[PDB]
């Protein structure tokens, strides 16, 4: 595995046939394995696209790897999903696992469906970043933090309080899977495409105010598109 | 001298680390008086000086293959180490070769006259 060396203002592959001493490895603290947010590559953040990026496969056992400090994530995910028979789906995170240190909008999902596979797997092989351990598998509970890792040779309340958008799942692990945003014990908004967590946040203008606000024992499910809100379009 | 990722690259790395230089008080040092676990994290934002970040994203992209292939070859569950081994091979490739002056090694100083 090659490492990028920072030298002469550029990255260079470490896997060369000469170890030129223009760079000195004075200590092990010049070593880096920093995580990077997958999102920083222009990768889509749609909740359905996230599903589209996971393999949903039974398979060779999961591994995680230790990695170095790195960038904040705007979007990450938490999962409660189970099989249609209520069986647990995806292993619970292993001891000492916690969600990534700085996702600003951790999305969360609940509900059930076939939830195919055992470890899911990232289709691009991108690592889930739980805390400081990169992963090949999706863990229940803790934040997914999709990302990639680079190895290189070196020469306030919102930091955890930020986090938005929780939703139900209808089915799981398939293209037919659907998700619905939930606020104020109301389930609405398929999250079909192009909706930032902030796009969804402004829709709390509807809570007990601009439309919505059922006068009945419970929620009616409006479709995301008043046109967006799909007020009174629940069925 | 390597090529930048062909993905669009976000140059602003608002980032966090567990690094925290110094220890103003020993209480910070004591686990009993230590910060909430997330408090170890500290933060700042990188700017893409010298174009390094977009190249870094490509480095990571290429690394997802090199690394994962290696990870498949590993037998450890949580693969806590790697870079240490890389430092070992740095030294192994730097040392035990023949080396007076003529060989391309040992960072030889100019001769005294």
């Amino acid at each position: 595995i090659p490492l990028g060396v920072i030298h002469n203002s550029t990255l260079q592959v470490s896997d060369v046939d000469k170890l030129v001493c223009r760079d000195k490895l004075s200590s092990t603290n010049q070593l880096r394995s920093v995580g990077l947010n997958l999102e920083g590559n222009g990768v889509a953040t749609d909740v359905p696209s996230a599903t589209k990026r996971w393999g949903f496969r039974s398979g060779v056992p999961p591994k995680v790897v230790n990695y170095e400090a790195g960038e904040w994530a705007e979007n990450c995910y938490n999962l409660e999903i189970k099989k249609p028979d209520g069986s647990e789906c995806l292993p619970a995170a292993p001891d000492g696992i916690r969600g990534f240190p700085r996702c600003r909008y951790v999305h969360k999902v609940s509900g059930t469906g076939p939830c195919a596979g055992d470890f899911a797997f990232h289709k691009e092989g991108a690592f889930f970043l739980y805390d400081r351990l990169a992963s090949t598998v999706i863990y229940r509970g803790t934040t997914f933090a999709e990302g990639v890792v680079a190895f290189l040779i070196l020469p306030p309340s919102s930091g955890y309080y930020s986090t938005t958008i929780r939703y139900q799942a209808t089915g799981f692990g398939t293209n037919e899977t659907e998700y619905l945003f939930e606020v104020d014990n109301l389930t609405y908004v398929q999250l079909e495409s192009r909706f930032t967590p902030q796009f969804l946040l402004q829709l709390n203008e509807t809570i007990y105010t601009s439309g919505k606000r059922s006068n009945t024992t419970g929620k009616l499910i409006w479709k995301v598109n008043r046109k967006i809100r799909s007020e009174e379009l629940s069925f | 001298a390597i090529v930048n990722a062909q993905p669009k690259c976000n140059p602003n790395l608002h980032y966090w680390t567990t690094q925290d230089e110094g220890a103003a008080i020993g209480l910070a040092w004591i686990p009993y008086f230590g910060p909430a676990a997330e408090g170890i994290y500290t933060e700042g934002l990188m700017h893409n000086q010298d174009g390094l970040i977009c190249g870094l994203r490509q480095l990571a992209n290429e690394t997802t293959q090199a690394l994962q292939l290696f990870l498949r070859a590993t037998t450890e569950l949580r693969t806590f180490s790697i870079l240490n081994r890389k430092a070992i091979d740095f030294l192994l490739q730097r040392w035990g070769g023949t080396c007076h002056i003529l060989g391309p090694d040992c960072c030889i100083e100019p001769h005294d006259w």
């Epitope: 920083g40 | 390597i2 976000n10 893409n48 174009g51």
Partner: antibody, heavy 118, light 107 residues
Framework: EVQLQESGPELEMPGASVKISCKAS????????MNWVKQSNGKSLEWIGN????????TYNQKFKGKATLTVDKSSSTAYMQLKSLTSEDSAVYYC????????????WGQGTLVTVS | DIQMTQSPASLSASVGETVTITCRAS??????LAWYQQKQGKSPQLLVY???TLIEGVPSRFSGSGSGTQFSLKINSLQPEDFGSYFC?????????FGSGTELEIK
């Protein structure tokens, strides 16, 4: 989408300083660390500087002598620049526009404001 | 600081005529390059980034090219909305030096 709102162009007395400001039209500016650029006399652009949108730390073009005051006010969705020791030769379109290192992000200022002196 | 230039200082063309603009940088920066366009009285819009690629919504007529110290922009079948000022830019850290500028003219 972010737009960088600013007041129309204005006449100034010599030796004037002007605190230029722009208010973003939306939330994406918070991670932008926006750039400043200039077109004196309609001439090709000079990079001016940038301001971190979380910390307000700044950098500026070292050929932009006497720099500019540079501040940010994330709570106001706004960022600032201050012109110094102005003369008529400094008339320029002053941009709050953001020149991203890459297309993953971008912002720009269409207001067309120009500061002039006499 | 990296120095940058552009030529021809202007380029007259008939509508539907393919045109090219070329530019240079004092040092090879491994394609941290960009291009911009504006109408008179209008702010520049990013056209190109990373040397060879286009900002979304830029028409297929445009083509980034080159790397490092030498790069160019081509517009196939140039259209009346495209006549304007052009710029180049350095993204290899800061300051973000710009090209000397060019402008299209109508035949």
């Amino acid at each position: 989408e972010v737009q960088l709102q600013e007041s129309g162009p204005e006449l100034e007395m010599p030796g004037a300083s002007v605190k230029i400001s722009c208010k973003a039209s939306g939330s994406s500016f918070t991670g932008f660390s926006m750039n400043w650029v200039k077109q004196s006399n309609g001439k090709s652009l000079e990079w001016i500087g940038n301001i971190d949108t979380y910390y307000g730390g700044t950098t500026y073009n070292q050929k932009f002598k006497g720099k500019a005051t540079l501040t940010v006010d994330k709570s106001s969705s706004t960022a600032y620049m201050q012109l110094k020791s102005l003369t008529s030769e400094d008339s320029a379109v002053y941009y709050c526009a953001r020149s991203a290192y890459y297309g993953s992000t971008f912002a720009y200022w269409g207001q067309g404001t120009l500061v002039t002196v006499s | 600081d990296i120095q940058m230039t552009q030529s021809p200082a202007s380029l007259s063309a008939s509508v539907g005529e393919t045109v090219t603009i070329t530019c240079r940088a004092s040092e090879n920066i491994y394609s941290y390059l960009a291009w911009y366009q504006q109408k008179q009285g209008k702010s520049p819009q990013l056209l190109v980034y990373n040397a060879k690629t286009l900002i979304e919504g830029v028409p297929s007529r445009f083509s980034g090219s080159g790397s490092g110290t030498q790069f160019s922009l081509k517009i196939n079948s140039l259209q009346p909305e495209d006549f304007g000022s052009y710029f180049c830019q350095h993204h290899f850290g800061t300051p973000f030096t710009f090209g000397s500028g060019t402008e299209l003219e109508i035949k």
